[PDB]
Amino acid sequence: IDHKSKYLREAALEANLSHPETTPTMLTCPIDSGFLKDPVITPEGFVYNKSSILKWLETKKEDPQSRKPLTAKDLQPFPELLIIVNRFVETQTNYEKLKNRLVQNARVA
């Protein structure tokens, strides 16, 4: 199963269905709830930040979500996802600037 392609198309759809201010789950880190900075993908198709999943593997050598056997070698770099992440974050910031300007202008108009 091409987990990279499946994750990309699913995360992209969720991003487009999500309001610019909303934070898409598939663009976040499962165990720390923050935006993905350096995403890696597992053979199961799960995606974490590199530093976060590695810190987890120090204590327990299993996936945090499925509790199935997992090692650092199973972690494949997923830089392509950063394209989707970066575009949403930049769009979110630009929309928050627009929204604030429109609201403020309407207060005094």
Side-chain angles (χ1 to χ4, degrees), residues 33-85:
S33 299
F35 271 113
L36 294 170
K37 301 179 180 180
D38 188 35
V40 292
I41 192 173
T42 69
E44 295 190 272
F46 296 151
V47 172
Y48 312 93
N49 280 327
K50 190 183 67 62
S51 62
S52 297
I53 185 59
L54 284 177
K55 186 177 181 179
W56 172 268
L57 292 178
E58 294 180 356
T59 301
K60 290 154 293 188
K61 305 188 64 179
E62 58 185 8
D63 184 87
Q65 304 183 69
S66 66
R67 295 313 182 102
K68 293 186 180 179
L70 180 65
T71 58
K73 135 214 128 265
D74 303 326
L75 302 179
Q76 183 186 25
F78 198 5
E80 301 88 351
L81 184 55
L82 280 180
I83 302 182
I84 301 182
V85 176

Side-chain angles (χ1 to χ4, degrees), residues 7 11 14-15 18-40 47-52 81-93 96:
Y7 197 98
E14 188 191 42
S18 300
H19 185 266
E21 293 179 298
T22 317
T23 307
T25 304
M26 301 188 67
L27 298 182
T28 64
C29 191
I31 77 183
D32 288 326
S33 299
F35 271 113
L36 294 170
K37 301 179 180 180
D38 188 35
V40 292
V47 172
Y48 312 93
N49 280 327
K50 190 183 67 62
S51 62
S52 297
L81 184 55
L82 280 180
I83 302 182
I84 301 182
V85 176
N86 293 332
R87 288 308 101 45
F88 192 92
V89 174
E90 293 171 12
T91 301
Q92 174 175 85
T93 300
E96 287 176 351

